[PDB]
C-alpha cells in the first residue's frame, strides 16, 4: 500500500476522480458549461473532438482545476459517443478519465461505467438548471421595460409565478444531489480508504461507494418510473424557455415601432393596440393550462415518492414538501 500511494499516487486519483469526473468541483464546471453553451446547443452531427479539446484547455487553465498536478490533469480528457441524425451536443458528450497506471485493478471498468452513468445524469440536470436561471434573468431584465406596455401585465405576472414553482423544485432536488448523494458516500469511502490495511479492503470500500451512489440517485431499474416523471419535469423547462420569449419577440418590438410612429408624426398603432386585445387571452389560457398540467404531474410524483424506498427516498419528501402545499392541492 505504501509503494502504491507514493510511487503512483493512488489517492490523488480518487481526489481527482470526485472533483472532476463526478463533477465534485463546480467552479470548473460552470465555466466549462458556459464556454460549451453555443457549441453544444448546436446539433452534434457536425461535432468532432478537436473543437472540444482546445476550448477545454482554456477552461482548465483559467479555473481552479489548474492547481492540481499535470499528470491527473493530463489523464482527464473529453470523449464523445456515437452520433445520430437527431443528435445535439447536450445529448452526446462525455468526460473520459483514461487510466495509464496499474490502478485499473482498484478502478475497474464496471465502476467506470458507473461513473459514466452518474455523470450523464448529473450533466442533464445541470444543463436544465442553467436554462432555468436564464429564464429568471430574462424575467429580471425584460420586465422593467414592459412597464410601459400595460396590457401584458396579466400574462407576464403569471409567468413569474410558474418560474417560482420550478425554481423551488430545481433548488431542492439540487440540494438532495448536494447532500447525502455525494456526501455520505464520500464519507464512507473516505474513512475506509484512509484507515485501510489491505488492498482488498480498499477495493471493497470502492464497491459499496459505487453501489450507494447508484441507489441514492435515480439510476435503478426500479426507480425508472420516477425517472420518467423527472424527465417530464425537464421537458417543461425548455417549453417555458420557448413561450416566455414567444411573448417578448412580439411584445417588446411593438414599443420601438410605436416610437417610430411618434417620430414619423413629428391610426396604425390603433390597430396594433387592437391586435393585443385578441392576442393576450389565448396566450394567457395557454399558460393557464400549462400550469395546471405541470402542477398535476408533480403531485403524482410526490405521492408515489412517499412509499418507494423506506428511508432514503422518504427524506426527499420532507425537503420537497416543506410547506405541505402538496396534499393540500389534492
Amino acid at each position: 500500500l505504501d509503494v502504491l500511494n507514493k510511487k503512483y499516487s493512488l489517492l490523488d486519483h480518487m481526489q481527482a476522480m470526485r472533483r472532476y469526473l463526478l463533477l465534485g468541483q463546480g467552479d470548473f464546471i460552470r465555466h466549462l458549461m458556459d464556454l460549451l453553451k453555443p457549441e453544444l446547443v448546436r446539433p452534434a452531427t457536425t461535432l468532432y473532438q478537436h473543437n472540444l479539446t482546445g476550448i477545454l484547455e482554456t477552461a482548465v487553465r483559467a479555473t481552479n482545476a489548474q492547481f492540481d498536478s499535470p499528470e491527473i490533469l493530463r489523464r482527464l480528457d473529453v470523449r464523445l459517443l456515437e452520433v445520430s441524425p437527431g443528435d445535439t451536443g447536450w445529448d452526446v458528450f462525455s468526460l473520459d478519465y483514461h487510466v495509464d497506471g496499474p490502478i485499473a485493478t482498484v478502478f475497474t471498468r464496471e465502476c467506470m461505467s458507473h461513473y459514466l452513468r452518474v455523470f450523464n445524469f448529473l450533466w442533464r440536470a445541470k444543463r436544465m438548471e442553467y436554462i432555468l436561471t436564464d429564464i429568471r434573468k430574462g424575467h429580471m431584465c425584460n420586465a422593467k421595460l414592459l412597464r410601459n406596455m400595460p396590457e401584458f401585465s396579466g400574462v407576464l405576472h403569471q409567468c413569474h409565478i410558474l418560474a417560482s414553482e420550478m425554481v423551488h423544485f430545481i433548488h431542492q432536488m439540487q440540494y438532495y444531489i448536494t447532500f447525502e448523494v455525494l456526501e455520505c458516500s464520500w464519507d464512507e469511502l473516505w474513512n475506509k480508504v484512509q484507515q485501510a490495511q489491505d488492498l482488498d479492503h480498499i477495493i471493497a470500500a470502492h464497491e459499496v461507494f459505487l453501489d450507494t451512489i447508484i441507489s441514492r440517485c435515480l439510476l435503478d431499474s426500479d426507480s425508472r418510473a420516477l425517472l420518467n416523471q423527472l424527465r417530464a419535469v425537464f421537458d417543461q423547462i425548455i417549453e417555458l424557455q420557448n413561450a416566455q420569449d414567444a411573448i417578448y419577440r412580439a411584445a417588446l418590438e411593438e414599443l420601438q415601432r410605436r416610437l417610430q410612429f411618434e417620430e414619423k408624426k413629428k391610426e396604425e398603432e390603433n390597430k396594433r393596440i387592437g391586435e393585443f386585445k385578441e392576442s393576450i387571452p389565448k396566450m394567457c389560457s395557454q399558460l393557464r393550462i400549462l400550469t395546471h398540467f405541470y402542477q398535476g404531474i408533480v403531485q403524482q410524483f410526490l405521492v408515489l415518492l412517499t412509499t418507494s424506498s423506506d428511508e432514503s427516498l422518504r427524506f426527499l419528501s420532507f425537503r420537497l414538501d416543506f410547506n405541505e402545499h402538496y396534499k393540500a392541492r389534492e
Partner: protein, 108 residues
C-alpha cells in the same frame, strides 16, 4: 425482373403513390435508376458494423436503459446465427436513429 418489381413496390409503398402514369412516379423511378447505376458508395466492413452495434449497446447502457440494452444485444446476436446479415443490419442502422424513448413493449 423481380428487382424491377421491387423498385416499383418500394417507390409505391413509401411514397404512397397509386399510379405509374403519375409523372412524379416517373421522376422518382428515374432517380432510383440513376442512384443504382452510379456507385460512389463505400463498401461495408463487418467489424465496423460490430463496433457500431456495441456502441449502440453502450449508449443504451449509459442512459440507464439496461433492459433494452440486454434485449438489443440478445436479439442482434440471435439474428447473426443461422454477409447478407451484415448488409441488412447496416441498412437498418443507417436508416434512422434518434432513440431517446423506449419504443418497445415486446419481450416475448
Amino acid at each position: 425482373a423481380q428487382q424491377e418489381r421491387d423498385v416499383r413496390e418500394l417507390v409505391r409503398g413509401v411514397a404512397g403513390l397509386q399510379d405509374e402514369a403519375d409523372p412524379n412516379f416517373q421522376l422518382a423511378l428515374n432517380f432510383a435508376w440513376s442512384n443504382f447505376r452510379f456507385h460512389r458508395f463505400l463498401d461495408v466492413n463487418s467489424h465496423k458494423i460490430e463496433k457500431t452495434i456495441e456502441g449502440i449497446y453502450e449508449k443504451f447502457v449509459i442512459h440507464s436503459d439496461l433492459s433494452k440494452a440486454a434485449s438489443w444485444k440478445r436479439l442482434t446476436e440471435e439474428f447473426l446465427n443461422a454477409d447478407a446479415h451484415y448488409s441488412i443490419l447496416s441498412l437498418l442502422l443507417c436508416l434512422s436513429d434518434s432513440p431517446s424513448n423506449s419504443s418497445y413493449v415486446e419481450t416475448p
